[PDB]
Symmetry: C2
Subunit: 211 residues, 2 copies
């Protein structure tokens, strides 16, 4: 399995998210409704994306902090495979979300932990023990040793790690030799002259490095 | 100023949130679109609530973790006065959100920090220095000394503190002598036989204790 290419749809309206998704959909592995977009338009976007892409992985990036079973159910019934919980969510909250998405989506339903602020590696092990083994790591605000070592360490622990922030066809090589699960890209690709060509070039660079 | 009564609308659909809001609106001080509801229906709810309640305080509970300026702008243009950021949001994120909501809503625009997981008092002081002085404290999963002391301490620091979780007309007295800014109630009130009567009894108990 090569690293996945994920497109983040972080648009402030429905037409922007749908247009971007359709423009790049055939060239990516994972299509994500980003939190900015969901807060604007609600979960019907998820259902529209599922209908357009029956076999693709679909992410509802809700960054759930509470009401885990409810939010997870609301998005799984729309067709999501993966849902994010914010790292400050409690273990009971994340477990409720995991159980609800697995209940509706036994084949692919998973929670991903969104990594923000001062999280710890003991916390991270608690996520693993809760049955949750995906985490989303963000570039500090290019990909220095401090960030890559945290990524490598999360990988050693047993996480499938997604990385996001400052990703381009040109910076992918910085991750050579690291077993990154998914690279999340956004406007770098969807705002390109040729979005599908940009998505393709990006995945072709993943092929060159990991293939 | 007495402690405010805030109703949380945490419904999984638009009709539930609107019906609950209308049922209790005249009896409460603050009407909140809860995160569960916003993830379902999007920010048009905020605009509907603003139109129904022109002079009321309106909360968009987005628990923003990132894209602070964008999310804050998206909800302020709909009419929100207060927006929540999750405590794991960075200081640059919270400052971007604060600046954007103040930009559209100079009279009442504020950020509130939603308190989840292992936050610290140094973090809390960083929020104050960032110009943010509201925090939402949740009952641990009735109102023992450990929780009340954290509340009292946040108040001593300079925060207007909202409390939520396990609030009833019967438990309000547990907070006697503490300068709570807002009590957030939810289904205890909106699911009552007489929602407006329940909202009224709750506020009447606030009057009795703080009046
Ligand atoms: Mg995302
Ligand atoms: Mg809330």
């Amino acid at each position: 399995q090569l690293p996945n290419l994920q497109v983040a749809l972080d648009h402030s309206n429905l037409k922007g998210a749908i247009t971007a998704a359709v423009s790049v959909g055939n060239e990516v592995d994972v299509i994500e409704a980003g939190t900015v977009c969901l807060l604007q338009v609600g979960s019907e976007l998820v259902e529209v994306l599922r209908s357009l892409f029956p076999d693709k992985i679909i992410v509802a990036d809700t960054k759930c902090a509470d009401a885990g079973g409810t939010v997870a159910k609301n998005n799984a019934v729309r067709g999501a495979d993966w849902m994010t919980c914010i790292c400050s969510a409690t273990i009971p909250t994340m477990k409720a979300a995991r159980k609800a998405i697995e209940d509706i989506n036994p084949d692919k339903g998973e929670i991903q932990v969104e990594l923000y602020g001062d999280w710890t590696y003991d916390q991270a092990q608690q996520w693993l023990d809760a049955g949750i083994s995906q985490a989303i790591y963000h570039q500090s605000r290019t990909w220095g040793e401090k960030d890559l070592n945290k990524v490598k360490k999360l990988i050693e622990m047993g996480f499938r790690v997604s990385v996001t922030g400052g990703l381009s066809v040109d910076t992918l090589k910085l991750f050579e030799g690291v077993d990154v699960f998914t690279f999340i890209a956004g406007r770098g690709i969807t705002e390109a002259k040729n979005p599908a060509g940009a998505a393709r070039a990006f995945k072709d660079e993943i092929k060159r490095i990991w293939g």
